[PDB]
Backbone as JSON, one array per atom type, in Angstrom:
{
  "sequence": "MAHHHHHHMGTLEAQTQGPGSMSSGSSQIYKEGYILDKNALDSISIGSSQEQVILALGTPSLKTKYDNEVFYYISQTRYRGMQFMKTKIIDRKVLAIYFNKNDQVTKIANYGLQDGQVFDFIAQTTPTATKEQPLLIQIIKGPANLP",
  "N": [[19.5, -65.21, -13.21], [22.42, -64.13, -14.85], [23.08, -60.84, -15.53], [24.69, -59.03, -18.05], [27.26, -56.48, -18.41], [27.65, -53.85, -20.55], [30.03, -51.71, -22.18], [31.92, -48.98, -23.54], [34.46, -46.71, -24.47], [36.12, -43.88, -25.92], [39.11, -42.0, -26.92], [40.35, -38.64, -26.17], [40.61, -35.01, -26.63], [42.98, -32.42, -25.75], [43.45, -29.28, -25.13], [45.84, -27.11, -24.02], [46.11, -24.46, -24.01], [44.49, -21.6, -22.93], [42.47, -18.67, -22.31], [43.11, -16.52, -19.54], [41.22, -14.58, -17.96], [39.04, -13.25, -15.95], [36.14, -11.35, -15.37], [34.42, -9.06, -13.08], [31.37, -7.91, -11.84], [28.28, -6.12, -10.95], [24.8, -6.5, -10.78], [21.57, -5.95, -9.99], [18.45, -7.27, -10.38], [15.15, -6.63, -10.02], [11.68, -6.72, -10.0], [8.1, -6.64, -10.88], [5.0, -7.77, -12.42], [2.42, -8.56, -11.9], [-0.53, -8.21, -12.77], [-3.02, -9.05, -12.11], [-2.94, -9.18, -9.46], [-3.29, -7.48, -6.34], [-1.14, -6.19, -5.27], [0.48, -5.34, -7.33], [-0.21, -2.76, -8.18], [1.52, -1.07, -7.01], [3.28, -0.31, -8.82], [3.2, 2.28, -9.85], [4.95, 5.37, -9.76], [6.41, 8.32, -8.11], [5.89, 11.31, -9.84], [4.56, 10.24, -11.96], [2.11, 10.57, -14.48], [-1.29, 11.78, -14.29], [-2.98, 10.51, -16.11], [-1.58, 8.2, -16.36], [-1.44, 6.95, -13.76], [-4.22, 6.63, -13.38], [-4.77, 5.01, -15.57], [-3.45, 2.8, -14.78], [-4.46, 2.09, -12.12], [-7.11, 2.93, -12.11], [-9.99, 5.14, -12.54], [-10.55, 7.79, -10.22], [-12.75, 7.37, -7.49], [-13.23, 9.21, -5.5], [-12.64, 12.7, -5.32], [-10.88, 15.75, -4.82], [-10.07, 19.22, -4.6], [-7.57, 20.85, -3.15], [-4.96, 23.26, -2.53], [-2.84, 21.6, -3.08], [-3.81, 19.45, -5.12], [-5.85, 16.48, -5.01], [-6.63, 13.08, -5.83], [-8.67, 10.56, -4.65], [-8.57, 7.18, -4.65], [-10.83, 4.82, -3.93], [-10.99, 1.61, -3.83], [-13.65, -0.14, -4.7], [-16.16, -2.64, -4.07], [-18.79, -4.65, -5.69], [-22.32, -4.95, -6.55], [-24.91, -6.41, -4.45], [-24.05, -9.37, -4.58], [-24.12, -13.05, -4.88], [-24.17, -14.09, -1.76], [-22.38, -16.27, -0.59], [-19.68, -17.34, -0.47], [-17.47, -15.71, 1.55], [-15.57, -13.59, 0.3], [-12.15, -12.81, 0.63], [-10.11, -11.52, -0.54], [-11.02, -9.28, -1.6], [-11.49, -5.8, -2.54], [-10.96, -2.84, -0.72], [-9.31, -0.85, -0.43], [-7.59, 2.28, 0.25], [-6.27, 4.66, -1.75], [-4.43, 7.62, -2.55], [-3.78, 10.1, -4.83], [-1.78, 12.72, -4.79], [-1.29, 15.39, -6.72], [0.18, 17.68, -9.14], [-0.93, 20.52, -10.93], [-0.04, 20.19, -13.45], [-0.9, 17.85, -14.11], [0.52, 15.82, -12.83], [1.9, 13.41, -10.53], [2.88, 14.34, -7.37], [2.93, 13.43, -4.89], [2.36, 10.33, -3.43], [-0.07, 8.72, -1.71], [-0.88, 5.95, 0.32], [-2.9, 3.2, 1.46], [-2.18, 0.24, 2.84], [0.24, -2.42, 2.27], [3.9, -2.03, 2.27], [6.26, -3.3, 0.38], [6.19, -5.51, 2.03], [4.68, -5.52, 4.91], [1.69, -3.87, 6.23], [2.05, -0.43, 5.77], [2.04, 3.01, 6.21], [3.19, 5.02, 4.01], [3.27, 7.85, 3.51], [2.72, 8.68, 6.03], [4.7, 7.67, 7.42], [4.56, 5.77, 9.35], [4.12, 2.54, 10.94], [1.66, 0.41, 11.13], [0.39, -2.71, 12.63], [-0.61, -6.1, 12.09], [-1.71, -9.2, 13.3], [-0.09, -11.76, 11.74], [-0.91, -14.32, 11.6], [-3.62, -15.29, 10.7], [-4.2, -13.7, 8.26], [-2.51, -13.98, 5.51], [-0.86, -13.33, 2.81], [-2.37, -11.17, 1.28], [-4.58, -10.46, 2.94], [-3.72, -9.12, 5.11], [-3.46, -6.38, 4.25], [-6.05, -6.08, 3.49], [-7.39, -6.21, 5.79], [-7.44, -3.73, 7.56], [-8.49, -2.24, 5.6], [-10.52, 0.13, 5.11], [-12.35, 2.98, 4.46], [-12.05, 5.94, 6.35]],
  "CA": [[20.23, -65.09, -14.48], [23.46, -63.12, -14.79], [22.98, -59.76, -16.5], [26.03, -58.55, -18.45], [27.45, -55.03, -18.39], [28.31, -53.36, -21.74], [30.74, -50.43, -22.0], [32.9, -48.59, -24.55], [34.86, -45.3, -24.46], [37.24, -43.51, -26.79], [40.11, -41.04, -26.43], [39.91, -37.29, -26.06], [41.55, -33.92, -26.98], [43.36, -31.65, -24.6], [44.09, -28.03, -25.43], [46.43, -26.55, -22.84], [46.02, -23.01, -24.19], [43.21, -21.01, -22.52], [42.59, -17.28, -21.8], [42.87, -16.36, -18.13], [40.74, -13.24, -17.66], [37.67, -13.25, -15.4], [35.65, -10.06, -14.96], [33.49, -9.04, -11.99], [30.45, -6.76, -11.81], [27.13, -6.2, -10.09], [23.54, -6.14, -11.39], [20.38, -6.43, -9.24], [17.21, -7.22, -11.15], [13.94, -6.9, -9.21], [10.46, -6.1, -10.53], [6.97, -7.55, -11.05], [3.94, -7.32, -13.29], [1.23, -9.46, -11.63], [-1.63, -7.25, -12.86], [-4.21, -9.7, -11.46], [-2.68, -9.14, -7.99], [-3.47, -6.1, -5.82], [0.23, -5.64, -4.94], [1.04, -4.82, -8.56], [-0.52, -1.36, -8.29], [2.69, -0.37, -6.45], [4.13, 0.01, -9.99], [3.21, 3.75, -10.1], [5.98, 6.1, -9.05], [6.29, 9.75, -8.03], [6.1, 11.94, -11.13], [3.71, 9.61, -12.92], [1.04, 11.45, -14.89], [-2.65, 11.46, -13.9], [-3.5, 9.49, -17.05], [-0.84, 6.93, -16.15], [-1.95, 6.38, -12.53], [-5.6, 6.17, -13.56], [-4.72, 3.91, -16.51], [-2.95, 1.62, -14.02], [-5.31, 1.77, -10.99], [-8.53, 3.22, -12.39], [-10.39, 6.51, -12.31], [-10.78, 7.96, -8.77], [-14.13, 7.48, -7.03], [-13.27, 10.43, -4.72], [-11.76, 13.73, -5.92], [-10.95, 17.02, -4.12], [-9.02, 20.21, -4.94], [-6.93, 21.76, -2.25], [-3.85, 23.83, -3.3], [-2.19, 20.39, -3.61], [-5.02, 18.7, -5.51], [-5.72, 15.04, -4.78], [-7.69, 12.13, -6.21], [-8.78, 9.4, -3.77], [-9.06, 5.86, -5.19], [-11.4, 3.84, -3.01], [-11.28, 0.39, -4.6], [-14.88, -0.59, -4.23], [-16.76, -3.91, -4.54], [-19.95, -4.5, -6.58], [-23.68, -5.07, -5.96], [-25.16, -7.51, -3.46], [-23.99, -10.65, -5.29], [-24.43, -14.26, -4.14], [-23.46, -14.12, -0.46], [-22.05, -17.67, -0.2], [-18.29, -17.31, -0.09], [-17.03, -14.42, 2.01], [-14.32, -13.26, -0.37], [-11.2, -12.17, 1.54], [-9.15, -10.8, -1.35], [-11.76, -8.14, -2.16], [-10.82, -4.51, -2.49], [-11.54, -1.7, 0.03], [-8.12, -0.1, -0.12], [-7.6, 3.69, 0.03], [-5.11, 5.3, -2.36], [-4.64, 9.06, -2.81], [-2.8, 10.71, -5.71], [-1.58, 14.19, -4.64], [-0.62, 15.74, -7.96], [0.28, 19.06, -9.55], [-1.85, 20.99, -11.97], [0.49, 19.72, -14.73], [-1.45, 16.5, -14.09], [1.62, 14.88, -12.48], [1.8, 13.06, -9.14], [3.96, 14.86, -6.59], [2.9, 12.71, -3.66], [1.48, 9.14, -3.51], [-0.51, 8.21, -0.42], [-1.39, 4.55, 0.17], [-3.32, 2.35, 2.6], [-1.78, -1.1, 2.45], [1.61, -2.84, 2.62], [4.98, -1.51, 1.48], [7.31, -4.32, 0.22], [6.16, -6.44, 3.18], [3.46, -5.43, 5.71], [0.99, -2.58, 6.15], [2.91, 0.7, 6.07], [1.59, 4.28, 5.68], [4.33, 5.66, 3.46], [3.13, 9.28, 3.71], [2.63, 8.91, 7.48], [5.97, 7.14, 7.95], [4.23, 4.89, 10.48], [3.94, 1.13, 10.59], [0.65, -0.37, 11.91], [0.66, -4.12, 12.63], [-1.71, -7.03, 12.21], [-1.23, -10.58, 13.52], [0.1, -12.44, 10.43], [-1.47, -15.66, 11.77], [-4.79, -15.53, 9.84], [-4.24, -12.99, 6.97], [-1.12, -14.11, 5.22], [-0.35, -12.34, 1.87], [-3.3, -10.05, 1.0], [-5.54, -10.2, 3.96], [-3.06, -8.08, 5.95], [-3.85, -5.08, 3.71], [-7.53, -6.11, 3.37], [-7.86, -6.1, 7.17], [-7.73, -2.35, 7.9], [-9.01, -1.63, 4.39], [-11.79, 0.78, 5.39], [-12.34, 4.43, 4.42], [-12.39, 6.48, 7.67]],
  "C": [[21.17, -63.91, -14.42], [23.32, -62.09, -15.9], [24.37, -59.19, -16.8], [26.06, -57.06, -18.51], [28.3, -54.57, -19.56], [28.94, -52.04, -21.48], [31.77, -50.24, -23.17], [33.17, -47.07, -24.5], [36.03, -45.06, -25.37], [38.15, -42.52, -26.15], [39.47, -39.66, -26.39], [40.97, -36.27, -26.52], [41.86, -33.14, -25.72], [44.18, -30.39, -25.02], [44.54, -27.35, -24.09], [46.32, -25.03, -22.82], [44.61, -22.52, -23.85], [43.38, -19.65, -21.92], [42.23, -17.18, -20.3], [42.5, -14.93, -17.8], [39.27, -13.27, -17.27], [37.31, -11.82, -14.94], [34.67, -10.16, -13.82], [32.66, -7.78, -12.04], [29.31, -6.97, -10.86], [25.88, -5.71, -10.78], [22.41, -6.77, -10.59], [19.12, -6.17, -10.1], [16.01, -7.6, -10.28], [12.75, -6.05, -9.71], [9.32, -7.11, -10.54], [5.98, -6.97, -12.04], [2.7, -8.19, -13.16], [-0.02, -8.58, -11.55], [-2.88, -7.78, -12.16], [-4.06, -9.72, -9.93], [-2.66, -7.68, -7.51], [-2.18, -5.42, -5.42], [0.83, -4.87, -6.15], [0.9, -3.31, -8.71], [0.6, -0.47, -7.7], [3.62, 0.07, -7.57], [4.21, 1.52, -10.25], [4.2, 4.46, -9.19], [5.77, 7.6, -9.07], [6.68, 10.4, -9.39], [5.02, 11.49, -12.11], [2.47, 10.47, -13.18], [-0.34, 10.92, -14.49], [-3.21, 10.37, -14.79], [-2.85, 8.15, -16.82], [-1.37, 6.21, -14.9], [-3.36, 5.88, -12.65], [-5.67, 5.0, -14.55], [-4.26, 2.62, -15.82], [-3.95, 1.17, -12.95], [-6.77, 1.91, -11.31], [-8.81, 4.68, -12.1], [-10.91, 6.67, -10.91], [-12.3, 8.14, -8.46], [-14.32, 8.73, -6.18], [-12.24, 11.43, -5.3], [-11.94, 15.03, -5.14], [-9.79, 17.93, -4.49], [-8.72, 21.09, -3.72], [-5.6, 22.15, -2.9], [-2.83, 22.81, -3.72], [-3.28, 19.39, -3.92], [-4.81, 17.22, -5.42], [-6.92, 14.25, -5.25], [-7.59, 10.87, -5.34], [-9.37, 8.18, -4.53], [-9.53, 5.01, -4.02], [-11.84, 2.63, -3.82], [-12.47, -0.29, -4.02], [-15.31, -1.95, -4.79], [-17.95, -3.61, -5.45], [-21.27, -4.65, -5.79], [-23.74, -6.27, -5.02], [-25.22, -8.84, -4.22], [-24.33, -11.84, -4.38], [-23.56, -14.35, -2.89], [-23.33, -15.55, 0.01], [-20.64, -17.75, 0.34], [-17.87, -15.9, 0.28], [-15.64, -14.13, 1.5], [-13.42, -12.44, 0.54], [-10.21, -11.33, 0.77], [-9.81, -9.61, -2.0], [-11.05, -6.82, -1.87], [-11.65, -3.48, -1.69], [-10.39, -0.8, 0.4], [-8.27, 1.39, -0.49], [-6.26, 4.18, -0.56], [-5.43, 6.78, -2.63], [-3.46, 9.66, -3.59], [-2.79, 12.22, -5.53], [-0.71, 14.62, -5.81], [-0.58, 17.24, -8.17], [-0.48, 19.29, -10.81], [-1.3, 20.67, -13.39], [0.08, 18.27, -14.93], [-0.4, 15.49, -13.78], [1.69, 14.65, -10.97], [3.07, 13.5, -8.4], [3.99, 14.26, -5.19], [1.9, 11.56, -3.77], [1.17, 8.64, -2.08], [-1.17, 6.86, -0.62], [-1.84, 3.98, 1.5], [-3.1, 0.9, 2.16], [-0.34, -1.37, 2.82], [2.63, -2.04, 1.77], [6.14, -2.55, 1.49], [7.35, -5.29, 1.41], [4.8, -6.41, 3.93], [2.88, -4.02, 5.62], [1.86, -1.41, 6.65], [2.36, 2.0, 5.4], [2.79, 5.12, 5.3], [4.39, 7.16, 3.78], [3.1, 9.65, 5.2], [3.93, 8.47, 8.16], [5.81, 6.25, 9.19], [4.06, 3.49, 10.02], [2.95, 0.49, 11.56], [0.96, -1.86, 11.79], [-0.62, -4.94, 12.78], [-1.16, -8.46, 12.33], [-1.3, -11.38, 12.2], [-0.49, -13.86, 10.47], [-2.5, -16.02, 10.69], [-4.56, -14.98, 8.4], [-2.9, -12.97, 6.24], [-0.54, -13.17, 4.15], [-1.15, -11.04, 1.72], [-3.99, -9.53, 2.22], [-5.04, -9.14, 4.96], [-3.47, -6.68, 5.51], [-5.35, -4.94, 3.63], [-8.14, -5.88, 4.76], [-8.34, -4.69, 7.48], [-8.26, -1.51, 6.69], [-10.44, -1.11, 4.6], [-11.6, 2.29, 5.32], [-12.8, 4.99, 5.75], [-13.74, 7.28, 7.64]]
}
């Protein structure tokens, strides 16, 4: 059976007058807020107050006063739960807030990645782990062990 093809179109308007002025600029927007992700804790920056860093990461499990006083965050696990699934995204990372007596961070030490792979910012060194097995997290979870 032959199917027919319907169609109908009307006229149009055409304004020849139009402003010719294009502007050019530059704006780079990059940030995150994945609080449920262990990368997010990178949000704290030098200067940030003790209350801020602890409000973001948590209160430090380790604390010591040397003339540049420092609080060590050792992100710890919990009790001997059901040992069925060997969780790989667990926390054993070492962070250290070197702050001034004005309760403000003047140096942030980190064990973990820096915008990519494991990088000791304060050490300026870059350790490496075969990305084969441990793709996003596991890389930082690998060497995640307090010395």
